[PDB]
Amino acid sequence: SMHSDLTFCEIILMEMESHDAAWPFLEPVNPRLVSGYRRIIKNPMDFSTMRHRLSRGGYTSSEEFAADALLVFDNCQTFNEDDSEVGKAGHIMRRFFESRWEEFY
Numbered sequence: 001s002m003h004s005d006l007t008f009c010e011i012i013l014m015e016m017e018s019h020d021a022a023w024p025f026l027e028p029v030n031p032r033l034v035s036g037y038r039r040i041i042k043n044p045m046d047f048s049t050m051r052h053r054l055s056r057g058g059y060t061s062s063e064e065f066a067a068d069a070l071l072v073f074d075n076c077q078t079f080n081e082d083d084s085e086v087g088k089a090g091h092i093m094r095r096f097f098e099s100r101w102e103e104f105y
């Protein structure tokens with residue numbers, strides 16, 4: 001299970017999930033709602049997958065956790081136009097994440 005040294009990552013992820021701009025990223029991009037996603041995006045990532053991976057010990061380091069957070073935002077900017085609702089949400093969430101991360105790094 002999660003090592004206590006990563007509790008700060010657990011908190012950041014919780015805070016991300018609570019943000020209104022997080023709605024596109026809470027669960028895996030859902031083929032019932034979004035077509036052609038995995039055709040383009042080879043490494044999907046979302047906050048629920050991160051939350052479960054973190055809790056079960058699937059992140060050894062904060063670097064691995066942050067890499068998955070950045071994958072959420074990188075995938076979003078690959079798939080979505082910057083002026084789309086989901087594209088804008090991704091940029092909000094990247095800034096929110098980086099601002100919390102930079103309190104530690």
Ligand SMILES: CCc1ccc2[nH]c(-c3cnnn3C)nc2c1
Nearest residue numbers: 023024025029033034076079086
């Ligand atoms: C469950 C509600 C919902 C509906 C549409 C969505 N679209 C995206 C998304 C994420 N990254 N790219 N897209 C297009 N998340 C969504 C969530």
